Symmetry: C2
Subunit: 98 residues, 2 copies
């Protein structure tokens, strides 16, 4: 079914992806940190891994998602301007007839 515009529910659901990925990484890391009986150098290694993982998440997901939302705001601004122009044109065409 063509839903001409994006619903608030679907935007609030689509922005959940980076949050859920970050929560997945955090839960994996918490399960890693749960084993208290652990080397310090291993913890530094795991910290480096966690940093690179979230850097990948931001480079591949959050960044492009935010860029798409900015581009869509530009598209929406242009479309609103054109539709306001068309509304004024139709209002002028119909109003003077009476």
């Amino acid at each position: 079914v063509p839903h001409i515009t994006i619903g608030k529910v679907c935007l609030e659901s689509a922005v959940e992806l980076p949050k859920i990925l970050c929560q997945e990484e955090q839960d994996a890391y918490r399960r890693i940190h749960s084993l208290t009986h652990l080397d310090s150098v291993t913890k530094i290694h795991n910290g480096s891994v966690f940093t690179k993982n979230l850097c990948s998440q931001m480079s591949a997901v959050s960044g492009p998602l935010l860029q798409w939302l900015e581009d869509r705001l530009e598209q929406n601004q242009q479309h609103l301007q054109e539709l306001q122009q068309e509304k004024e044109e139709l209002m002028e065409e119909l109003s003077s007839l009476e």
Copy 2:
């Protein structure tokens, strides 16, 4: 050829391996930074990779090598004590005999 004990030359050669591995990683990182015009999150990711690589190098090479050298020092102390005991025993055996 059975070389009963360690020459200093071989220790000075064995300690060059961690240096060469660290230098290899460092040269990789330096050649990575040549295209300075690069994303910042990507540079954080590459820094994390460098840190994880050196953490692995220390966990798998430098650490076990240092443990081996400490174990060898303990072995040499025990062996020195045993050989001193044996030297005293042979000194007594040759003094009392003829």
